[PDB]
Design a protein around this ligand. Structure first.
Ligand SMILES: Cc1ccc(CNC(=O)[C@H](CCc2ccccc2)NC(=O)[C@H](CC(=O)NCC(C)(C)C)NC(=O)c2cc(C)on2)cc1
Ligand SMILES: [Mg+2]
Ligand SMILES: [Mg+2]
Ligand SMILES: [Mg+2]
Lengths: 230, 235, 204, 246, 238, 212, 229, 198
């Protein structure tokens, strides 16, 4: 009887509408993030509705030094990454200052929070992995629609995320040291994403990759350009 | 303001229901005029019938209404009707045609039917008026925003009874005095009360005076009702 | 370019013994051009009379407005508005447009149906009340009208005498004004009846 | 909450207005009697404790110098209506016509405020009934009752609240169209004795008249066309004087 | 506050129930001839002692060349008719041409559609037949709108109570190959079809003829009564 | 600027000069003062370059939108009135334009509307607009016949623009010619006044006011 | 209206999709020679004039779309799409990218007006950067690109038949026949030129709705090709 | 100034309006109709500021046509004129007033009498046997003061206008390119095309 709206606590102090929004993530195709000290990588397995369909785009560029991957409601990733584009843009125009990744984190948390507290609205239903290279190096972030954000060396979200999160949890000391070596960080990313596959062997359409770093602007790789990583 | 599975408007139906308990009002359209008569529900010896008005209201010099339903809801709508008349007169330098004023009021009611989440007005009106396009006119409107025109009609309590009687005794070539009579007889047989006295009645006529060329609105004084009771043999 | 002087016109009102009088010219011009010689500037709402000089569009608009308000007033109060009260209504309706006024000079005249006491009043364009017991003047020949009235007037004139005094005041004031004249109408007002008279005057 | 909290039931009743009337029913009794040269409104000052100060509560309120009001039902609801009523007597009337409104029209405006609470979104009807007594030059003396629905009606005499039924009855026996004001006061004092339980003196009884003009309550002399307020609250001492001659 | 929402089966119940009010509404029909369109409407029976001089008949003029009839809530129809009349004048004012019948239909359909997805409003309890002729054109036009906002053109069509029945009649009686080439045999088919549901009445059936170039005439009780007689004869001749 | 449009037997002739000025500075000699709205619709520009260019480019957009909505090309009457109504909203704000909307539709035949930023909208057979207008009217009015051959009507328009280019300081550059028929508009070339003047002088034997 | 189920789907969005399943079929096929859109008219009666059934509409010269579901809901989307394509041309002197146009319509879709749209759209077009394209736009605000797709009451069956028949070298003429074929299979009625409507968009000629006479010829050619085995 | 003239004879109202439209140094059109039919028995002529003129007239026209259809009834000339007055009187005090003067000529079928109304941009309304706007009135008012009679025929009224126009062609500085003349009587509104030669 307590899951009507977000403006309502349960007797045990839970917010069910938020918990249910969190659930939409677990239906999202798996995505992985990880970083050394000189780069950060996103690997996102894209999901297809049919064999005739696109494996829908899961990586959105936010600035020349920042970007994200989504798992859950794509429309919600679009609302939030758009807000992130504006916020990164504002930082440039007004202050001539590239936006700190942490600062992006706090901003997303706050945007998500409002939606957990007012009647008529609804929590966002998408989890996001955020990578960037700023004035303090490489950064990876995990956003939950509850408004919780965490900074990590690596992680995964979406269906069966636990596999890759386990692989990375052990490979920690191996990848954190892939400084100055780009291709070997993407490898480690791809090697992590497969520990959560089951469906198949990841193909040339299955895969989406994004890298940002010391002298590398945020770029998305799709298809022919990712073939050398399978 | 929602539909039932059958295609009916809950709050409207229930409002008509409210009205069906209100004192009766009758409109009769003659050849040379119009009668309005209405019965005051709930009375007492102490209720001041002299300086009183609760069912018959002047809208204009050429238009009056009879009210069945919530008195206070009615005053709201009477007041905006009075203003619409005046806007029309200011705009055009001509008194508002009866239909137009009636359409406007019905439209306001229909509004509460279709939007805003507010309860409909619990009111039905009989409109008596004269204009130079259609002469004498009798109209009726209810909470559904619907309006129709009549030779004779009744609203409020006991409309089935009263309706039957009017249908039985009305004729096209009637005269106003006969209509006054018909109005009183009809209320006389549908009253929920002992017998029809003067203090339980409101009465009004709209007649095109034989000496002039202009229309006169008369709202009968207490003594004038009392008198018109004796003549027709209800003493 | 002064809106008070585009169209032209005059109104005067006087009290007599158990009577009042209010008179006006009929000209409607645009500057030098006489345009209409049937433009009456006196109106009535029941037994209350209102004369209005100044910009002709505002004269029309004001009459329509006061017809409107006194209609509604009669419906709610179930009696005709009295002169003392209409005066206050005029005043406040004018002051409401304090920073974009109607360019008019209204005059009120009537007898109080309860007291029988005769009553006149005037206003400036923002509703300041001039309450004189003797006479009130308005229009483009106001100076002339003031001259005529102060000279001609006496208290307690019979309706038939008051008619002469007010007509002579108007006619002679008019004849020294370029923008007034072209006709004139006089209302003699008693508790019981009202006589309206059209004056013969110079058509230049 | 922008929807009406008072809706029609299938029987055609308006629930919240009925329940408001029930609240009025539990209220302390109040009455008005119209004389030929006056109107009197009266009620009981139910002290919640003997430590409370009776005088500090207006149950009978001046609305304009010729119009008074008394109530039954919820005191706080009444208190805001008096305020809104005084203000509307100015904004809708004195600021337009330079005289105070006539009784029926002020009553009309109050009725309007109450009707609106019957229909606007997010609100409940007022839980009061008012008796409004007044005078104006053209209608003379009058007395009106206003109910939670916004309905109003004129009475020669009436009573509302707790012991209304019996009091309406007692008044019906005692009222004639030739009563002098002092007689109406006396009758009012009798009717009130029946409904009251404990003490019955000038400090438990509030009474006001709408009578003649009181020049000495005006505040100033000079303008003879102004004669002063017709409304007058009777003093505790003045009530006791009329009680001893019961 | 969202009143028109989806249900699990993918149905908007308020829109659905609005259709029920149309079903409950008195019947209306239109058929389109070779050079005309005819509109016909039955008359109610809650009471009779009415004044017909002043009471609004069922066919409304929108512009001089376009007419609208409806089944459903009478009060809801006034509102759609007003907006249609305002649009008709507005189209003349900005395009220097009167509305095509299709355009005026699309407009009204749009309005009804809009009320199916706005907070705090209920859909229109109305379906319309909209008939007339495009400016400077002789090809006849007939269109139907419904509370959902769907619209389309019809060789012939009926709406309201017992439209189910009368659509059966027209489906076998209207020959697309041969539209009633006369105004007369067009009124004939329109009367036959209403007769199946009306249960005999001259004060029951009303008819309106619309021809090209703003030629629109209502018939009289007697004029219709002539068709009533010749149809009940040719059926009793068999 | 000089722009003209006239109606005749063979449809509509539309001609414009190509000069833009700021004060006495000649800003350009190669400016396009005709907008091709759709294959059957033309707009001409005079007054503020920005105002015309912006609002008539926009006019084309609103015209395209009509095609999609009504499945039918917009009438000259209706296109002209969109511009006219827009411009009227802005009255007093200082927009400066004088334009002609020219085209053919089946129901209207060849039609010309004159629209200016005062909000004036006129249907007519002959208009000249701009600072050179009177110089064009002079030549055009005294040679205009309804029965002009297509070939003679093109020359008349051309020559009328030449006339204004010559006498009006704020006209010049080149002439751009259009012919509008049942089938839509046809471009009849760009003609530099630099060359056109001398040719016409020699061939026609006019411009005797001119040195050698 | 903006409530989550415990499964983390939006009630109103899921029910919206059920409404779409009740609609007339719409099929689109994307080739290298064009993109074909076909629809099932589904007249509720023989008196209804079938040519007044507009379920394939032009958005711009290079972009068409078919709909399925509560089709009245699509007027404001089509309007928004047209305005967006025209506006883009006004601001940029070029044709809008097909994906951008779809994204803009999906943006409109997100804007929870009391309820979601009860209609899905197939958006087909061409542009220089990404060639011929087909898109499915749901009332969720999500959109998907497809080589081939079917929506409405016959979709589950049709999608399977499209899985079989589609290959990356289908000629336009082949693809047209395939649309007719799969429509013939899933329609309640017998497919003819009055209850089915074909359309295509080619780079060279833009979006064209096929007239009944041209569709009839393709129906005839289809019948003859199948009566060989 | 453009010439708008109006005269009401015994059984009709006649409107005459100049055909020239002049911007700056050029006469752009010599055949303009400065009139809109408001209803089959009511006509309005107008002159004033360039854009305002037609926008106002068409706006009044659309409003009157709408009323007709809503009520299936033609408003009286008196009623139409009060509507126009109020509209002008509103605009006079707005941010940008319409600078338009009008004559309203109509035949009141209920009274069987022709009516001529003169109204300026301020909303100054007056009913008159003959009227004019702008400089015109300066010549024609005195002409008509002399030659006008209440019981003239329509044919007499047209000869009176010829006189009015002639005076204006003699003494006015601007070439207004002749007038368009229109009659409003019991049978509606027709245009007298024979005015360039009579
Ligand atoms: C496309 C096209 C070009 C030119 C023309 C003809 N107009 C003109 O030539 C007018 C004449 C002056 C005028 C200005 C404002 C209002 C009235 C008159 N000139 C103009 O508008 C010129 C145009 C210009 O210089 N454009 C630059 C190039 C496009 C050539 C690179 N602008 C200005 O005068 C101007 C000045 C300021 C300040 O803001 N605009 C018509 C159409
Ligand atoms: Mg002065
Ligand atoms: Mg003088
Ligand atoms: Mg003189």
């Amino acid at each position: 009887n307590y899951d009507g709206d977000t403006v309502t606590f349960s007797p045990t102090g839970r917010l069910f509408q938020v918990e249910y929004a969190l659930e939409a993530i677990k239906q999202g195709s798996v995505t992985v993030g990880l970083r050394s000290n000189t780069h950060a990588v996103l690997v996102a397995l894209k999901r297809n509705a049919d064999e005739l369909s696109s494996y829908q785009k899961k990586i959105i560029k936010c600035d020349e030094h920042m970007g994200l991957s989504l798992a859950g409601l794509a429309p919600d990733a679009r609302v939030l990454s758009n807000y992130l584009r504006q916020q990164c843009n504002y930082s440039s125009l007004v202050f001539n200052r590239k936006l700190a990744v942490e600062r992006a984190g706090h901003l997303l948390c706050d945007k998500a929070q409002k939606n957990t507290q007012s009647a008529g609205g609804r929590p966002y239903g998408v989890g996001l992995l955020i990578i960037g290279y700023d004035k303090s190096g490489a950064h990876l972030l995990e956003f939950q629609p509850s408004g919780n954000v965490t900074e990590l060396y690596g992680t995964a979200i979406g269906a069966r995320s636990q596999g890759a999160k386990t692989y990375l949890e052990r490979t920690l000391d191996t990848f954190i040291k892939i400084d100055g070596n780009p291709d070997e960080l993407i490898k480690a990313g791809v090697e992590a994403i497969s520990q959560s596959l089951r469906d198949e062997s990841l193909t040339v359409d299955n895969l989406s990759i994004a890298i940002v770093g010391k002298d590398t602007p945020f770029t998305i790789y799709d298809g022919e350009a990712v073939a050398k990583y399978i | 303001t929602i539909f039932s599975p059958e295609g009916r408007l809950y709050q409207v139906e229930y409002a008509l229901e409210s009205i069906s308990h209100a004192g009766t009002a009758i409109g009769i359209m003659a050849s040379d005029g119009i009668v309005l008569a209405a019965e005051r529900k709930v009375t007492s010896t102490l209720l001041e019938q002299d300086t009183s008005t609760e069912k018959l209201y002047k809208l204009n010099d050429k238009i009056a209404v009879a009210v069945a339903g919530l008195t206070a809801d009615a005053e709201i709508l009477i007041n905006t009707a009075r203003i619409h008349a005046q806007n029309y007169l200011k705009t055009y330098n001509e008194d508002i045609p009866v239909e137009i004023l009636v359409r406007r009021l019905s439209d306001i009611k229909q509004g509460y039917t279709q939007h805003g989440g507010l309860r409909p007005f619990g009111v039905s009106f009989i409109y008596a008026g004269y204009d130079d396009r259609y002469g004498y006119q009798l109209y009726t409107s209810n909470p559904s925003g619907n309006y129709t025109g009549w030779k004779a009609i009744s609203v409020g309590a006991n409309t089935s009874a009263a309706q039957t009687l009017l249908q039985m005794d009305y004729k096209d070539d009637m005269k106003v005095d006969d209509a006054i009579e018909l109005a009183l007889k009809t209320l006389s047989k549908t009253t929920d009360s002992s017998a029809l006295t003067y203090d339980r009645l409101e009465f009004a006529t709209i007649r095109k005076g034989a000496n002039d060329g202009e229309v006169y609105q008369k709202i009968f004084k207490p003594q004038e009702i009392k008198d018109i009771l004796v003549k027709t043999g209800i003493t | 370019s002064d809106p008070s002087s585009i169209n032209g016109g005059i109104v005067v009102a006087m009290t007599g013994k158990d009577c009042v009088a209010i008179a006006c010219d009929l000209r409607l011009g645009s500057q030098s051009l006489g345009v209409s010689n049937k433009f009456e500037k006196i109106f009535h709402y029941g037994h209350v009379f209102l004369g209005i000089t100044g910009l002709a569009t505002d004269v029309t608009t004001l009459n329509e407005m006061f017809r409107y308000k006194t209609n509604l007033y009669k419906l709610k109060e179930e009696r005709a508005i009295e002169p003392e009260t209409f005066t206050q209504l005029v005043s406040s309706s004018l002051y409401e447009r304090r920073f974009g006024p109607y360019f008019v000079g209204p005059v009120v005249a009537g007898i109080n149906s309860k007291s029988g006491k005769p009553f006149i009043a005037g206003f400036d364009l923002i509703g300041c009340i001039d309450e004189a017991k003797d006479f009130i003047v308005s229009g483009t020949a106001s100076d002339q009208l003031f001259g005529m009235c102060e000279s001609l007037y006496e208290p307690n004139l019979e309706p038939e005498d008051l008619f002469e005094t007010i007509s002579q005041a108007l006619l002679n004031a008019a004849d020294r004004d370029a923008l007034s004249g072209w006709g004139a109408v006089v209302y003699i007002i008693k508790k019981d009846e009202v006589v309206k008279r059209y004056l013969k005057m110079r058509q230049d | 909450y922008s929807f009406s909290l008072t809706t029609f039931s299938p029987s055609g009743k308006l629930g919240q207005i009925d329940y408001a009337l029930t609240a009025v029913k539990q209220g302390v009794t109040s009455l008005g009697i119209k004389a030929t040269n006056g109107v009197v409104i009266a009620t009981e000052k139910k002290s919640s404790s003997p430590l409370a100060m009776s005088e500090t509560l207006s149950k009978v309120s001046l609305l304009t110098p010729d119009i008074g009001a008394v109530y039954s039902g919820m005191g706080p609801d009444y208190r805001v209506l008096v305020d809104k009523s005084r203000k509307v007597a100015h904004t809708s009337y004195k600021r337009i016509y330079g005289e105070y409104p006539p009784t029926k029209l002020l009553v009309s405006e109050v009725a309007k405020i109450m009707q609106e609470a019957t229909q606007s979104g997010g609100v409940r009807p007022f839980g009061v009934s008012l008796l409004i007594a007044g005078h104006d030059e053209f209608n003379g003396f009058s007395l009106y009752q206003v109910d939670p629905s916004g309905s109003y009606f004129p009475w020669k005499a009436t009573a509302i609240g707790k012991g209304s039924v019996a009091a309406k009855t007692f008044l019906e026996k005692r009222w004639n169209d030739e009563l002098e004001l002092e007689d109406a006061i006396h009758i009012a004092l009798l009717t009130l004795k029946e409904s009251v339980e404990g003490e019955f003196n000038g400090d438990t009884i509030e009474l006001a008249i709408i009578g003649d003009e009181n020049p000495d309550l005006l505040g100033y002399t000079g303008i003879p066309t102004d004669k002063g307020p017709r409304f007058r609250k009777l003093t505790s001492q003045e009530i006791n004087d009329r009680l001893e001659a019961l | 506050r969202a009143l028109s929402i989806f249900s699990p089966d993918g149905h908007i119940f308020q829109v659905e129930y609005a259709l029920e009010a149309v079903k409950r509404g008195t019947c209306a029909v239109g058929v389109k001839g070779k050079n005309c369109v005819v509109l016909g409407c039955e008359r109610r029976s809650t009471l009779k002692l009415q004044d017909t001089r002043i009471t609004p008949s069922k066919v409304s003029k929108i512009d001089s060349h376009v007419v609208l009839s409806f089944s459903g809530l009478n009060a809801d129809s006034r509102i759609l008719i007003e907006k249609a009349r305002v649009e008709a004048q507005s189209h003349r004012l900005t395009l220097e041409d009167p509305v095509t019948v299709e355009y005026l239909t699309r407009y009204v359909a749009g309005v009804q559609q809009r009320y199916t997805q706005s907070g705090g409003v209920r859909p229109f309890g109305v379906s319309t037949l909209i008939a007339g002729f495009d400016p400077r054109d002789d090809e006849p036009k007939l269109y139907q709108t419904e509370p959902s906002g769907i619209y389309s053109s019809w060789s012939a069509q009926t709406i309201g109570r017992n439209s189910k029945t009368v659509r059966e009649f027209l489906e076998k009686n209207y020959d697309r190959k041969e539209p009633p080439a006369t105004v007369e045999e067009c009124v004939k088919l329109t009367v036959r079809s209403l007769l199946e549901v009306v249960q005999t009445g001259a004060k029951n059936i009303e008819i309106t003829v619309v021809k090209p170039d703003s030629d629109i005439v209502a018939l009289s009780s007697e004029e219709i009564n002539q068709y009533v007689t010749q149809i009940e004869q040719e059926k009793q001749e068999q | 600027t000089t722009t003209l449009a006239f109606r005749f037997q063979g449809g509509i002739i539309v001609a414009v000069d190509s000069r833009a000025t700021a004060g006495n500075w000649v800003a350009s000699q190669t400016v396009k003062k005709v907008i091709e709205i759709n294959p059957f619709l033309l707009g001409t520009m005079a007054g503020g370059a920005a105002d015309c260019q912006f609002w008539e480019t926009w006019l084309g957009s609103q015209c395209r939108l009509h095609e999609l909505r009504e499945k039918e090309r917009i009438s000259v009457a209706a296109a002209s009135k969109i511009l006219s109504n827009l411009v009227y909203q802005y009255k007093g704000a200082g927009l400066s334009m004088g334009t002609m909307i020219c085209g053919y539709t089946r129901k209207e035949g060849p039609t010309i509307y004159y629209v200016d930023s005062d909000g004036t909208r006129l249907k007519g057979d002959i208009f000249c607009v701009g600072s050179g207008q009177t110089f064009a009217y002079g030549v055009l009015d005294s040679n205009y016949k309804w029965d002009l051959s297509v070939e003679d009507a093109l020359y008349l328009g051309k020559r009328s623009i030449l006339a204004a280019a010559h006498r009006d300081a704020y006209s010049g550059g080149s002439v751009n010619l259009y012919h509008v028929t049942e089938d839509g508009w046809i471009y009849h070339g760009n003609h530099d006044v630099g060359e056109l003047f001398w040719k016409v002088k020699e061939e026609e034997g006019s411009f005797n006011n001119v040195i050698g | 209206v903006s409530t989550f189920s415990p499964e983390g789907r939006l009630f109103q969005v899921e029910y919206s999709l059920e409404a779409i399943k009740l609609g007339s079929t719409a099929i689109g096929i994307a080739t290298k020679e064009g993109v074909v859109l076909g629809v099932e008219k589904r007249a509720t009666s023989p008196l209804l004039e079938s040519d007044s059934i507009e379920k394939i509409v032009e958005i711009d010269r290079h972009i068409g779309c078919a709909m399925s579901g509560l089709t009245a809901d699509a007027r404001s989307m089509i309007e928004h799409a047209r305005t967006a394509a025209v506006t883009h041309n006004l601001y940029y002197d070029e044709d809008i990218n097909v994906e951008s146009l779809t994204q803009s319509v999906c943006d409109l879709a997100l804007r929870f007006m009391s309820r979601p749209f009860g209609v899905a759209l197939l958006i087909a077009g061409h542009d220089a950067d990404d060639g011929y394209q087909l898109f499915h736009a749901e009332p969720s605000g999500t959109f998907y690109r497809y080589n081939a797709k079917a929506i409405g009451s016959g979709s589950e069956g049709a999608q399977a038949e499209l899985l079989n028949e589609w290959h990356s070298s289908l000629t336009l003429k082949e693809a047209e026949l395939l649309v007719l074929k799969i429509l013939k299979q899933v329609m309640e009625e017998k497919l003819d030129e009055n209850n089915a409507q074909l359309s295509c968009i080619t780079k060279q000629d833009g979006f064209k709705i096929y007239d009944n006479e041209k569709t009839a010829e393709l129906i005839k050619e289809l019948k003859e090709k199948e009566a060989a085995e | 100034m453009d010439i708008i003239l109006g005269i009401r004879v015994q059984d009709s109202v006649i409107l005459a309006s100049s055909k020239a439209v002049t911007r700056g140094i050029s006469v752009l059109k010599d055949s303009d109709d400065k009139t809109r039919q408001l209803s089959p028995h009511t006509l309005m002529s107008f002159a004033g500021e360039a854009g305002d003129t037609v926008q106002f007239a068409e706006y009044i026209q659309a409003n009157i046509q709408l009323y007709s259809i809503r009520e299936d009834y033609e408003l009286s000339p008196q009623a139409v004129s009060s509507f126009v007055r109020q509209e002008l009187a509103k605009s006079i005090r707005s941010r940008r007033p319409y600078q338009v003067n009008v004559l309203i000529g109509g035949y009141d079928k209920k009274k069987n009498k022709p009516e001529l109304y003169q109204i300026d941009y301020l909303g100054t309304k007056v009913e008159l046997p003959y009227g004019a706007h702008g400089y015109s009135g300066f010549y024609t008012f005195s002409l008509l003061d002399h030659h006008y009679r209440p019981d003239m025929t329509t044919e007499e009224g047209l000869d009176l206008l010829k006189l009015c126009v002639q005076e204006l062609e003699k003494r006015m500085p601007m070439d207004f390119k002749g007038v368009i003349v229109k009659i409003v009587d019991k049978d509606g509104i027709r245009q007298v095309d024979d005015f360039q030669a009579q």
